[PDB]
Amino acid sequence: MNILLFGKTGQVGWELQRSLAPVGNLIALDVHSKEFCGDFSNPKGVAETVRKLRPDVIVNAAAHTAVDKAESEPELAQLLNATSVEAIAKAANETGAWVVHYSTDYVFPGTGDIPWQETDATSPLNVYGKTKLAGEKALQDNCPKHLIFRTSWVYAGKGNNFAKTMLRLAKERQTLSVINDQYGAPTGAELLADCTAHAIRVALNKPEVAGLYHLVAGGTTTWHDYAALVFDEARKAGITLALTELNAVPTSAYPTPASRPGNSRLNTEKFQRNFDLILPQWELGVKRMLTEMFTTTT
Amino acid sequence: MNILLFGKTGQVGWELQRSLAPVGNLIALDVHSKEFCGDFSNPKGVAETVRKLRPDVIVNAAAHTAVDKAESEPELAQLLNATSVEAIAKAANETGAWVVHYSTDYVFPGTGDIPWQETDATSPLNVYGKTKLAGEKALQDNCPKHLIFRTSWVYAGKGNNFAKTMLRLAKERQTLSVINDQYGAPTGAELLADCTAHAIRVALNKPEVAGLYHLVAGGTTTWHDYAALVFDEARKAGITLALTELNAVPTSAYPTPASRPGNSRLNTEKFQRNFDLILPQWELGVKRMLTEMFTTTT
Numbered sequence: 001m002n003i004l005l006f007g008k009t010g011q012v013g014w015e016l017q018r019s020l021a022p023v024g025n026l027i028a029l030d031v032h033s034k035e036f037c038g039d040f041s042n043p044k045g046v047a048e049t050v051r052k053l054r055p056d057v058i059v060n061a062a063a064h065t066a067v068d069k070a071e072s073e074p075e076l077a078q079l080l081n082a083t084s085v086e087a088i089a090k091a092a093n094e095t096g097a098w099v100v101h102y103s104t105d106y107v108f109p110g111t112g113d114i115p116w117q118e119t120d121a122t123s124p125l126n127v128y129g130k131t132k133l134a135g136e137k138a139l140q141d142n143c144p145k146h147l148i149f150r151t152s153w154v155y156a157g158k159g160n161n162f163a164k165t166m167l168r169l170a171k172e173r174q175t176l177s178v179i180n181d182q183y184g185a186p187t188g189a190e191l192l193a194d195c196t197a198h199a200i201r202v203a204l205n206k207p208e209v210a211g212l213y214h215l216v217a218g219g220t221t222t223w224h225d226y227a228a229l230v231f232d233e234a235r236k237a238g239i240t241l242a243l244t245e246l247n248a249v250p251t252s253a254y255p256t257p258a259s260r261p262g263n264s265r266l267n268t269e270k271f272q273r274n275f276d277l278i279l280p281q282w283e284l285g286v287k288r289m290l291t292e293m294f295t296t297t298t
Numbered sequence: 299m300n301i302l303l304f305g306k307t308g309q310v311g312w313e314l315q316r317s318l319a320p321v322g323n324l325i326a327l328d329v330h331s332k333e334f335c336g337d338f339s340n341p342k343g344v345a346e347t348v349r350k351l352r353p354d355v356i357v358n359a360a361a362h363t364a365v366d367k368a369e370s371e372p373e374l375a376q377l378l379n380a381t382s383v384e385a386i387a388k389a390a391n392e393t394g395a396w397v398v399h400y401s402t403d404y405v406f407p408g409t410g411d412i413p414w415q416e417t418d419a420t421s422p423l424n425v426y427g428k429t430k431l432a433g434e435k436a437l438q439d440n441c442p443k444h445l446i447f448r449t450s451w452v453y454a455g456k457g458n459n460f461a462k463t464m465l466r467l468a469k470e471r472q473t474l475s476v477i478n479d480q481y482g483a484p485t486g487a488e489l490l491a492d493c494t495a496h497a498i499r500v501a502l503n504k505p506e507v508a509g510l511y512h513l514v515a516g517g518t519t520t521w522h523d524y525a526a527l528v529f530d531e532a533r534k535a536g537i538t539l540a541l542t543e544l545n546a547v548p549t550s551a552y553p554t555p556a557s558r559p560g561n562s563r564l565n566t567e568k569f570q571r572n573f574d575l576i577l578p579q580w581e582l583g584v585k586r587m588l589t590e591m592f593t594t595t596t
């Protein structure tokens with residue numbers, strides 16, 4: 001069967017290019033796709049594309065993902081995180097195609113301790129969350145063969161990521177400051193991509209799995225504890241670090257235009273039992289990307 | 299369920315560490331595994347390990363893979379490519395576990411033009427092939443819940459590979475010589491790993507899929523044409539190359555201790571229809587590993 005992937009160059013998209021390749025005949029698009037429209041600024045054009053190809057499955061990894069900039073341009077975000085999602089949803093539903101789509105925990109507020117469930121009420125704390133909410137609701141109302149994967153703290157080894165930015169700091173600096181009161185599970189693009197591939201093959205066989213899912217690596221940590229592991233990992237690999245002092249700091253002390261939740265924890269029991277898949281502890285995925293970065297035959 | 303992977307540090311193994319992680323609880327071993335035996339020099343010890351854990355699925359990516367050295371030490375190869383495969387097979391069969399195992403086209407002779415099929419007769423041209431034959435036959439006779447994936451020209455982006463070795467040459471040299479009369483499909487460790495993960499999930503549900511499979515990327519090329527693509531890819535990415543002259547050369551003109559087949563072509567229709575998976579053209583996988591190597595955020 002035919003699979004159409006939008007957002008092929010993103011973190012998750014680049015991993016989907018790999019994961020979806022054996023599952024069906026993959027057509028991978030992004031914004032610059034010359035010979036096919038992959039620019040979510042043209043909701044009608046991504047519809048046309050979806051009519052032009054007729055896919056059995058659409059995997060959407062494109063989005064407006066700069067949360068802070070979104071506050072300054074809620075319009076463009078709306079277009080990318082909702083308008084084009086509806087346009088692709090309705091078109092998907094013209095042909096009975098499945099639509100796979102990623103969302104975010106920014107759809108919930110904040111209240112430490114408890115992991116959010118799919119049955120929990122939503123009240124988006126910032127713009128990103130809002131437009132993405134509009135996006136999943138739109139998918140929900142226009143295209144019943146869907147899989148929405150709500151995720152959080154996504155990283156990949158290709159391209160910039162938290163680990164790397166922190167490592168640049170740790171090379172160039174002696175003391176460093178990082179949030180220790182935001183809680184979640186760093187989730188690999190590898191894990192996302194692979195789970196998607198399997199979930200597609202179930203859904204084709206069991207249409208009842210359609211719906212909304214929480215999808216993250218297991219466990220929970222904070223940015224400061226995440227950074228500590230990265231530091232330690234790098235010390236263990238022989239990366240010399242200028243860094244001598246690592247201090248934990250509250251969220252508030254340093255500005256971000258759009259608010260971040262203190263509680264990005266997500267319960268993923270729904271996904272685990274509906275797909276019979278395992279979601280490994282967050283550390284595995286991070287240590288693996290760190291090794292790949294450190295043992296770079298080159 | 300529990301998955302046990304031997305050969306976790308190899309090309310295919312490193313990709314299996316990722317691909318198998320959502321499929322079940324993964325225990326990943328290699329030779330140096332301190333707290334568990336993963337050294338195929340101790341066939342009884344890998345048996346013990348397999349009894350110590352009781353897996354539902356065993357994925358074996360460990361092997362003696364230095365074909366030329368094998369001619370000088372057919373004994374050690376036998377141990378790694380057959381003896382330990384039988385020991386793990388018989389133990390697998392004590393508990394009804396599935397055994398997944400990789401083999402090679404070196405199991406066939408040579409006769410250009412036609413792709414080898416699973417129903418074709420085998421006559422191994424070198425030691426590697428022989429011990430690996432002993433390995434699959436042993437698996438075949440001792441453990442009926444098996445999946446043998448015969449593959450060829452395997453590469454990964456981590457660690458040394460043909461692309462890289464060639465690129466080192468192309469940086470340091472002006473003229474280069476490479477075989478143009480050996481035919482096959484370079485097959486990515488990514489493709490291998492992902493197909494394995496899916497094939498496991500079918501086999502658990504449809505035990506009749508058990509058996510021997512040809513598994514390679516589609517198409518066919520030669521080392522010289524493969525190297526040309528790598529050169530071109532790198533020229534397209536801005537890698538400056540000293541290389542000015544690229545000459546095709548026959549196999550014979552330059553020595554290898556163990557013989558290489560002129561015909562590594564493999565027909566993979568069996569795998570495609572039994573698993574309902576797609577096997578993409580070899581170029582995709584190579585261009586992707588090249589991009590990852592070239593766009594190395596670092």
Ligand SMILES: NC(=O)C1=CN([C@@H]2O[C@H](COP(=O)(O)OP(=O)(O)OC[C@H]3O[C@@H](n4cnc5c(N)ncnc54)[C@H](O)[C@@H]3O)[C@@H](O)[C@H]2O)C=CC1
Pocket residue numbers: 006007008009010011012013030031038039040041060061062063064065080101102103104105151152153154155
């Ligand atoms: N990155 C994160 O922390 C998280 C991401 N997610 C979701 O996961 C999904 C993937 O995220 P990433 O891979 O991190 O995103 P990314 O930022 O790496 O990738 C963004 C993708 O959107 C594409 N894009 C940008 N503008 C576009 C336009 N005008 N038209 C079409 N495509 C355009 C980019 O080209 C790229 O392929 C998105 O749904 C995202 O909202 C969810 C939770 C957190």
Ligand SMILES: NC(=O)C1=CN([C@@H]2O[C@H](COP(=O)(O)OP(=O)(O)OC[C@H]3O[C@@H](n4cnc5c(N)ncnc54)[C@H](O)[C@@H]3O)[C@@H](O)[C@H]2O)C=CC1
Pocket residue numbers: 304305306307308309310311328329336337338339358359360361362363378399400401402403449450451452453
């Ligand atoms: N590499 C290739 O061109 C091809 C490989 N294959 C098969 O694919 C499989 C994987 O190949 P690669 O990932 O390329 O292999 P590799 O050479 O990258 O990995 C070899 C693996 O065997 C392990 N190993 C070596 N000695 C061991 C010992 N004494 N005990 C336990 N493990 C030991 C290594 O530690 C490593 O994990 C093997 O079955 C191989 O024969 C098949 C066709 C071609």
Ligand SMILES: [Mg+2]
Pocket residue numbers: none
């Ligand atoms: Mg990778």
